[PDB]
Amino acid sequence: KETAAAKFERQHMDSSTSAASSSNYCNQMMKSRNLTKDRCKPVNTFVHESLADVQAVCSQKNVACKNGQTNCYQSYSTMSITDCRETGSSKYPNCAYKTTQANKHIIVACEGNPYVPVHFDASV
Numbered sequence: 001k002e003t004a005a006a007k008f009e010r011q012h013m014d015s016s017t018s019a020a021s022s023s024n025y026c027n028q029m030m031k032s033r034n035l036t037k038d039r040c041k042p043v044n045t046f047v048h049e050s051l052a053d054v055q056a057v058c059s060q061k062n063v064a065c066k067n068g069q070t071n072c073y074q075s076y077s078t079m080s081i082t083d084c085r086e087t088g089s090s091k092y093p094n095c096a097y098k099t100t101q102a103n104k105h106i107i108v109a110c111e112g113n114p115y116v117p118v119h120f121d122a123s124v
């Protein structure tokens, strides 16, 4: 099995690169992180910051989650991220994505003890 915390790291953490990306960043990352196995995951964001910095967001600005829950948090500082959006011509299993880089405040949902990220909600 895989914990929600571990899944968040697999799906949304990529500290190995500051700005990372290459036009093919997402095409390679969505596949390597196994996000295209059961289907082409439509949208997924990778954060280029230390695990500590991202985990710390759980003690930052409390904001409402898109699903109505109250356990979401927004980072006070902007973070380097890469949004991966499935193209319109993408056809499983050959999932194709558009690699977009940006510097925004991330919003994640946190749960557990330790209180850590378990869902990436949005960026603003």
Ligand SMILES: O=c1ccn([C@@H]2O[C@H](CO)[C@@H](OP(=O)(O)O)[C@H]2F)c(=O)[nH]1
Pocket (backbone or CB within 6 Å): 011, 043, 044, 045, 046, 118, 119, 120, 121, 122, 123
């Ligand atoms: O800015 C955004 C918005 C959404 N998601 C993607 O949307 C899912 C469905 O809520 C998420 O998976 P998750 O709950 O497994 O994190 C997230 F991964 C991102 O990666 N970035």
